[PDB]
Amino acid sequence: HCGYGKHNGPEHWHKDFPIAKGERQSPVDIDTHTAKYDPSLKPLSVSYDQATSLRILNNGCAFNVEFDDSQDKAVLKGGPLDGTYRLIQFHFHWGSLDGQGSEHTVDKKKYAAELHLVHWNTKYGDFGKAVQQPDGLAVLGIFLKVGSAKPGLQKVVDVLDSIKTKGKSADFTNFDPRGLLPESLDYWTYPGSLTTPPLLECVTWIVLKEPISVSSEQVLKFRKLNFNGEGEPEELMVDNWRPAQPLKNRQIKASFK
Numbered sequence: 001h002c003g004y005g006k007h008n009g010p011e012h013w014h015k016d017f018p019i020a021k022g023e024r025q026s027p028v029d030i031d032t033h034t035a036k037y038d039p040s041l042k043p044l045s046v047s048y049d050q051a052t053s054l055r056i057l058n059n060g061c062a063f064n065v066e067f068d069d070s071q072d073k074a075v076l077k078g079g080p081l082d083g084t085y086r087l088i089q090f091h092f093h094w095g096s097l098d099g100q101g102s103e104h105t106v107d108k109k110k111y112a113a114e115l116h117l118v119h120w121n122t123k124y125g126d127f128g129k130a131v132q133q134p135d136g137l138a139v140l141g142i143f144l145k146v147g148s149a150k151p152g153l154q155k156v157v158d159v160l161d162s163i164k165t166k167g168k169s170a171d172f173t174n175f176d177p178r179g180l181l182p183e184s185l186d187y188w189t190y191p192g193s194l195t196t197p198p199l200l201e202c203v204t205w206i207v208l209k210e211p212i213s214v215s216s217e218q219v220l221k222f223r224k225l226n227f228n229g230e231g232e233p234e235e236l237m238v239d240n241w242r243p244a245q246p247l248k249n250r251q252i253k254a255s256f257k
């Protein structure tokens, strides 16, 4: 029962998941002055044209927008990656206040939220096998700041009322995740982990430098979700983020100068 409260938050997770104190945990602070431009990084390729979204689920920790990954319909390639990674879901982490909510930080700056587009390496055949491998997943991370509304986010915001509590799901077809990307695909990359239990060290992180802007009203609706199940005492789904973890023996590489 790991979670985000005082008694079961991130600082407690290591008791159930000893890898929480491992050598390649995420998120991390991205020190922009220490990251190294890597001329070898090939360009990043986000091919979401045939993306097939299916459902949106409140899983008690965030909400997940799930995709049909039974075929290469929406994939991530290039950049630091070898091979083809299939989109399986995206989710966010966000704060109680506009000054916090992101998992990664940039020169210790926290953003209001962070989008994770989760992809698995097709050479491992399924998601469950992929998470057991050091190069199993590629997660595209996108910062959110509060400013102008993001039109491509609004279809998500408007369905949240129907998945308020843990375990609720709703149909979420014909959603285009391209609407959540910033203009630039300049990124930072490093090897890390899932940022929730089981905290598996199976992720190539690709974090976009350019944030997207969402409106105050949009993030406010995120904060009206619930960690709890229906008919339970209400605990707002806020501050579902893990703080920065020790970089240890890792170098963050930049795709840009």
Ligand SMILES: [Zn+2]
Pocket: 091, 092, 093, 116, 195
């Ligand atoms: Zn995440």
